[PDB]
């Protein structure tokens, strides 16, 4: 009833679907806050209140799939989160290069949200988007080096991965879990 490739992991589209439930800041380009001096949003999964009280260019926070729906039309702009600016990503790059073992504390959704917003909101960034793409690429490459170091220390016992992304984890998950399972089964089998 569940396909083999979905049995013990998430598809990248499911990882996207998870990340799309996160709140994001938008500048509305419609006004829905009816003045004191008609259809309302009436949602059941998320905060209905913000969308019914939008005013144009008063920034407000909504769930990301609604922000993408409004940005498919010209009816909002999505404010790129503070970490995704050039200066912040450069600080994270310096952290990654300065601490060879720790992963830098980017948010768990960083690669997923970078991909989403670089595609669907390429015009909304204050910084030039080619630099943001370049530095997101720098971060992924440096973090992949750190992953390849970490996998030399797989155990039958456990492992710790402090600030690894949801996407990076989900990409590694079948390999790490299967190999550690087999190391366990070798070790436990040897016990009397």
């Amino acid at each position: 009833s569940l396909p083999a490739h979905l049995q013990q992991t998430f598809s990248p589209e499911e990882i996207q679907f998870i990340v799309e439930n996160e709140p994001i800041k938008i500048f509305p380009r419609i006004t829905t806050r009816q003045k004191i001096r008609h259809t309302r949003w009436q949602l059941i999964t998320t905060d209905d209140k913000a969308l019914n009280n939008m005013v144009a260019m008063r920034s407000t926070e909504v769930v990301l799939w609604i922000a993408l729906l409004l940005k498919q039309q010209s009816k909002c702009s999505i404010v790129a989160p503070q970490w995704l600016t050039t200066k912040e990503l450069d600080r994270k790059i310096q952290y990654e290069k300065t601490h060879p073992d720790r992963f830098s504390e980017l948010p768990w959704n960083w690669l997923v949200l970078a991909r989403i917003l670089f595609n669907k909101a390429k015009d909304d960034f204050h910084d030039p988007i080619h630099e943001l793409r370049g530095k997101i690429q720098d971060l992924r490459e440096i973090r992949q080096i750190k992953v390849l170091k970490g996998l030399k220390y797989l155990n039958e016992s456990h492992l710790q991965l402090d600030n690894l992304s949801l996407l990076e984890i989900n990409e590694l998950r079948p390999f790490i879990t299967e190999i550690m399972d087999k190391l366990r089964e070798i070790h436990t089998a040897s016990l009397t």
Partner: protein
């Protein structure tokens, strides 16, 4: 002119690091993936080099025998930057070219094509055994044992004629333990 060579190298480094189509950094990806499977080369489509900055392609095609080693050097530097945490060893990377320049048939190649990049086709009628060419020679003076080295780019070197500070007329010898070599093969194209 070493500053100019450094700017050529940095131009190629920027080409590897910056060239992108449809949201993918194709040469960063290709170089990383090549490093993972431990083949130290990069296949470059010169349509992309032209599309990036035709000044670089003009420099490359004017004198490839000088420019190709600089491009190889740039690839090594980017390879280290995208696969090693520096401030916590890889060889000289081979450049490989893809092209769609108009073919010159093998009979029409003559003296005006000397040292130009050329595209041609034919039938391989023989393939010689492999042979070892030096990339890095560790070099010693026979009398004073002054040691030096030659780093070689295989696009056309010799041992120095006399000692680089009597010491004999023709004194240098190779230290075969520290010297580095590469595979070379000869083919005949009909």
């Amino acid at each position: 002119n070493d500053d100019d060579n450094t700017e050529i190298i940095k131009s190629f480094k920027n080409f590897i690091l910056e060239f992108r189509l449809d949201s993918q950094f194709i040469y960063r990806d290709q170089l990383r993936n090549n490093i993972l499977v431990k083949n130290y080369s990069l296949t470059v489509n010169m349509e992309h080099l032209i599309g990036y900055n035709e000044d670089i392609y003009k420099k490359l095609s004017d004198e490839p025998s000088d420019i190709i080693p600089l491009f190889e050097t740039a690839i090594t530097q980017v390879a280290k930057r995208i696969s090693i945490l520096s401030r916590a060893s890889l060889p000289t990377f081979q450049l490989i070219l893809n092209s769609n320049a108009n073919q010159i048939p093998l009979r029409d190649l003559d003296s005006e094509h000397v040292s130009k990049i050329v595209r041609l086709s034919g039938i391989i009628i023989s393939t010689s055994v492999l042979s070892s060419r030096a990339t890095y020679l560790s070099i010693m003076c026979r009398n004073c044992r002054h040691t030096t080295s030659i780093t070689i780019n295989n696009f056309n070197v010799s041992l120095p004629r006399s000692c680089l500070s009597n010491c004999g007329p023709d004194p240098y010898i190779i230290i075969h333990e520290s010297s580095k070599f590469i595979d070379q093969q000869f083919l005949k194209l009909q």
